[PDB]
Amino acid sequence: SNILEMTKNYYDRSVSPVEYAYFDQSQNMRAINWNKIVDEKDLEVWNRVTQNFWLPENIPVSNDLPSWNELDDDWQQLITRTFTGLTLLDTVQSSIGDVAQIKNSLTEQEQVIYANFAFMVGVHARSYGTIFSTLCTSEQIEEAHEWVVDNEALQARPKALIPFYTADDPLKSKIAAALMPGFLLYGGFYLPFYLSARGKLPNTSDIIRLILRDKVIHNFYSGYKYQLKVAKLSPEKQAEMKQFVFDLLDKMIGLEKTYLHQLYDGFGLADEAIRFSLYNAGKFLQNLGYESPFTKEETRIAPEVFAQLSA
Amino acid sequence: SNILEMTKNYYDRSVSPVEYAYFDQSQNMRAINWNKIVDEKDLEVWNRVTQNFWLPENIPVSNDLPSWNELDDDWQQLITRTFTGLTLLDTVQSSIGDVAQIKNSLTEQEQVIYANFAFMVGVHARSYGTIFSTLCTSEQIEEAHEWVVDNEALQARPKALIPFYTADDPLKSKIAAALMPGFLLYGGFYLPFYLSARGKLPNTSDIIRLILRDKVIHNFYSGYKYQLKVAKLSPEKQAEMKQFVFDLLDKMIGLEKTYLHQLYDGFGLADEAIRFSLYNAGKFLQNLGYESPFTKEETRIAPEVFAQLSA
Ligand SMILES: [Cl-]
Ligand SMILES: [Cl-]
Ligand SMILES: [Cl-]
Ligand SMILES: [Cl-]
Ligand SMILES: [Cu+]
Ligand SMILES: [Cu+]
């Protein structure tokens, strides 16, 4: 009788609203408690992403018009197409991926952080529109949208990830959520950094660096939460989930290579864009707590391009 | 044919990713187009809510310590309880309500605006935490959480709305989404406006006004989208939906009056808070395109409270 509980704390006999909504209606709901934080990492991430709030109106893209006008119609078309492709991936992540993570949160604050991610990835998608409004003709903008809809190699990539978001396996959904910021857009981000290394569209690369300042935290955070959940599996199911991560990444690399060859082969950027992509595939695995199986040679980035990425 | 259509518009032969995820896989996905906007109201709302970005760290709540210390322990408890009750409603809306609206959007931009709403309602919930961190003891904060979990009259209100969010009727989900910012938190906001009218906690009322600057747009926007969708239904289905709105508001007013009497009867604020609540119930109906049935007498607000509201 030394250990009898006469006073049960409110937290352990209540559920967050999203748990009440989708999982269990047998207990009453608790309001989020920002005064007693379960995981200090959540407060650190919340503070950084909110402090890093930006809008594309903040960047004078109109100052890129001189260097934009130096590029021929084929280069301008490549940039508009590439960025409309990245707009599609951001639309998938903002409208499906991030908000699917909310109900699978380990902590109250994580629910609010994924709401921030959904909004800020929406700002990322909106940023390409700001660039197009300033630089592109109406014809270039409409052509790029037509090209995205009709590009099967482009479409294959989000079509591969969306099922994990809409299915009922929260760990597979979390892996998909990490793979988007961790890997899938870097093939596209190569192009603006290739150009800004040569002094072309520098203001556009400032927008890409603001996008990446968010995406690196998104990848870190989803990877961190993945590691906390996978640690709660049996060693058998742990090894099983690791194999799934490597199998899914192997598949997505296959689809990304096909798309980047189609996108870039005509411009001689395919090989370097794929190396840049695999460098980030390595970082993605590291943020899930795994070792990168990729060689120095097959992840090689030109110093002038790496300088644009890390700035 | 005098009109030659050489190609078919990409938009009419593609779906947004969230439509692809949940409703229709018959066509490929289109990237959001911020360059050709279907509804200029979406751009106006996007620009206003993003330009209105704020964090509770922006407001010096520490300057309220003198007026907070003037308030007796029972008034401090009432404020902590009331605000933890509002925190629960914001947690419901941020984690379930707003994100549930994304897949039911009429336009691409609406998907991104509801992501902004989810994030900003998260900031609203967080702002109570900031106030508590500055003003309240650990004991007051824990007591208020215990009080929220064990308050059946409080819990009844979100428990009535959450089923509309998780169900597959998008119009009933939209009405629930409008009811939260339009009606359910005004009973609670009465208290800080009452206090600031008497010169107490002025900095806290600045946070409440920043919250209300967001919530008035949330209510307007959800009501605007409700009106566009319901207008396309048969006269009989429009009549059915109008009856549902009035029936649900009638139920929620019943639950709100019970909760506000329990909250405020001891302080003699219940009748005044309920009139303030019903005034806003009238505005909620107007924002759905219906007429207010409420009398002048049952919606009467003291000028000094209305002054704090509209400042
Ligand atoms: Cl992302
Ligand atoms: Cl993300
Ligand atoms: Cl709200
Ligand atoms: Cl809302
Ligand atoms: Cu992201
Ligand atoms: Cu709201």
Q: How far apart are CA A140 and CA A137, in angstroms?
A: 5
Two structure tokens written together for B43: 């751009």
Residue A172 CA to residue A160 CA, distance in Å, equals 12
Token pair, residue A198, equals: 């040569």
Resolution of the experimentally solved model in angstroms: 1.5
B92 Cα–ligand 2 center, Å: 21
C-beta separation of B175 from B248 below 8 A: yes
How far apart are the C-alpha atoms of A113 and B92, rounded to whole Å? 15
Chosen for mutation from B8, B20, B24, B35 (greatest number of chain A CBs closer than 10 Å) is B35
At B154, which helix (H) or strand (E)?
helix B152-166
Distance in Å, CA B180 to ligand 4 centroid: 7
Give the separation between CA B274 and CA B267, rounded to whole angstroms: 14
Q: Which of B35, B46, B90 sits opposite A133 (nearest CB)?
A: B35
Q: Do B95 and A112 touch (CB under 8 A)?
A: yes
Find out whether A222 and A164 touch, Cβ atoms under 8 Å.
no
Residue A187 in contact with residue A259, Cβ under 8 Å? yes
Question: Does B82 carry a binding-site annotation?
Answer: no
Could you tell me how many helices (H) and strands (E) chain B has, helices first? 14, 0
Q: In this complex, which of A17, A98, A132 lies closest to B92 when CB atoms are compared?
A: A17
Q: Where are the alpha helices (DSSP H) in chain A?
A: 17-22, 40-51, 65-70, 73-92, 98-102, 108-135, 138-150, 152-166, 170-179, 186-196, 202-230, 235-264, 270-287, 303-310
Nearest to B148 among A21, A30, A128 (CB): A30
- For residue B283, the CA-to-ligand 5 centroid distance in Å is 37
> How far away, in angstroms, is A117 Cα from ligand 5 center?
6
C-alpha triplet B159, B164, B165: angle, nearest 5°: 95
* DSSP 3-state of A115: helix
Q: How many whole angstroms from B75 Cα to the centroid of ligand 4?
A: 29
Whether the Cβ atoms of residue B96 and residue A17 lie closer than 8 Å to each other: yes
- Point out the catalytic residue in the list B128, B221, B224, B226: B128
A95 Cβ contact partners less than 8 Å away, ≥ 6 residues apart = A118, A122, B16, B17, B18, B21, B102, B103, B111, B112, B115
CA angle (A137, A140, A143) in 5-degree steps: 145
Residue B2 touches chain A, beta carbons under 8 Å: no
How far from each other are the two terminal CA atoms of chain A, in whole angstroms? 62
- Choose among A123, A157, A151, A102: nearest CA to A50: A123
**Contact residues on chain B for A122, CB-CB shorter than 8 A:** 111-112, 115-116
> Judged by CB atoms within 8 Å, which residues 156-175 of B form the interface with A?
158-159, 162, 165-166
Determine phi and psi for A29, rounding to 5 degrees: -95, 145
Question: Solved by what technique?
Answer: X-ray
Q: Which of A91, A110, A157 to mutate to test the interface with B (most CBs of B within 10 A)?
A: A91
Q: Of the candidates A201, A142, A229, A23, which has an alpha carbon nearest to the alpha carbon of residue B11?
A: A142
**CA nearest to A141 within chain B:** B35
Phi and psi dihedrals of B29, rounded to 5?
-90, 145
A110 touches chain B (CB under 8 A): no
Q: Which two tokens stand for residue A250?
A: 């192997």
Question: Minimal Cα distance from A164: which residue of B?
Answer: B21
State the Cα–Cα distance between residues A247 and A181, nearest whole angstrom. 18
Instruction: Decide if A216 contacts A52 (C-beta within 8 A).
Output: no
C-alpha B190 chain-centroid distance: 15
* Residue among A114, A128, A186, A190 flagged as catalytic: A128
Distance from CA of B293 to the nearest CA of A (A): 32
A99 contacts in chain B (CB < 8 Å): 99, 102, 115, 118
CB-based contact, A38 to chain B, within 8 Å: no
Q: Which residues of A touch B125 (CB under 8 A)?
A: 31-32, 34, 112
The distance of B198 to chain A (nearest Cα, Å) reads 28
Give catalytic status of residue A128 as yes or no: yes
Tell me the sheet residues that pair with B29. B15
Type of residue at B144:
A
Residue A5, CB half-sphere, CA atoms under 13 Å: how many? Answer: 6
> Does B258 count as an annotated binding residue?
no
Which chain A positions have a beta carbon within 8 Å of B49's beta carbon? none
State how far the Cα of A86 lies from the Cα of A117, in Å rounded to an integer. 16
The residue of A27, A34, A82 whose CB has the most chain B CBs within 10 angstroms, and thus the best one to mutate to test that interface, is A34
Domains defined along chain B, listed by start? 10-308 (1.10.620.20)
